[PDB]
Amino acid sequence: HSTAIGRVWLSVIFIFRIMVLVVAAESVWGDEKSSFICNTLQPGCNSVCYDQFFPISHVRLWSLQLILVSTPALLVAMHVAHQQHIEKGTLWWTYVISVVFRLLFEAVFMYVFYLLYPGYAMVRLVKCDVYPCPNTVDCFVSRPTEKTVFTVFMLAASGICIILNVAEVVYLIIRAC
Template identity: 55%
Template sequence: MDWKTLQSLLSGVNKYSTAFSRIWLSVVFVFRVLVYVVAAERVWGDEQKDFDCNTRQPGCNNVCYDHFFPISNIRLWALQLIFVTCPSLLVIMHVAYREERERRHRLKHGDKCARLYDDAGKKHGGLWWTYLLSLFFKFVVEIVFLYILHTLWYGFSFPRLVQCAGVSPCPNTVDCYIARPTEKKVFTFFMVGASAICIVLTVCEIFYLISQRISRSLRGVKRKGAALHSPSSSRASTCRCHHLLPAHGGEEGANLGKGAEALRASAPNLTLI
């Protein structure tokens, strides 16, 4: 896997992300991807070779190893990192779609025409929903992989001795020993802790986005109510009425106009309604 390419792609998410998402991305690359590449691969690199069982039965070591480790930790974490980081690319794709749509709109109608988007990367409309759905997807993926890891290894624990019983072709009960169980347990708890931090950050960002959307909607409702009850609207209607007075056709309209001017001259403080 080319982690540099993935990092360069995800770095563009920072342009359209909140503070919570920037912290999440830092935690992923510093405490998960970096630890995975530098240390975790080496810790689990010899897990099958050094998985020793007290039998010479051909194939028993492989069968017992597959029985206790149906999926390697290192490969499971690689899948988890891929599934967790890929939803962020949906945001970049949506922004790119908006920019392309804006470009075609400019080519068709010219630069003097009004823009489709004030800011293509601003989280409004469909982009807000895309961003929120990506957060929900990341949250679900983290929970599912933690559940799988907890179920496969009985609570993230690595015992020194495991017993392989009733598994063909192993005779009777076979004792097998895991290589460097303490070191693997430490790294497992570290990765689980980093995953838990990412879950907390994702939940915080979900609540932040929803609360921000609600407050923005409430402010919009207040502004509309203030505009409807503003005294400027009544003044505007009065002014329109004044302008409409001389607009009557024929002699009747001219007489009305003259009568209004006479009233203004005789009583300058009088206001026509």
């Protein structure tokens, strides 16, 4: 029990997302903290300002999102293996449940991205006033344009995944009827 469009398209988009994350994590986000600098003589201002403006990096968010999204399919695969071992529309039901959970995980991670980083674009200069920085200090972000490009790519792929998951759920409902 599996839709024809979904197995072809969802897997391809997932592989595309994984490949983009691999080519982006190593190089684009590698020096995100080491090259983050602020115009100040205050010790510790660089670290606290980086922590303030980047609570969790985009790459780690995408990695966690991919792991969480792949988890329900992993559970389904283990269940199928154990069923096959025991053999030596309940499956339809658990499959639709897994698809719904994948959709929910994708949507929640998109909302978390909206909360933490309102706006897809990354700015060159940020103003930080966290203790122990005196008054407000200027800090400069590493590769904001390249990071913006990769953010657009990953968000577009995630949105395509969301729409495709809704379409797959609708197809499953139609198959039931």
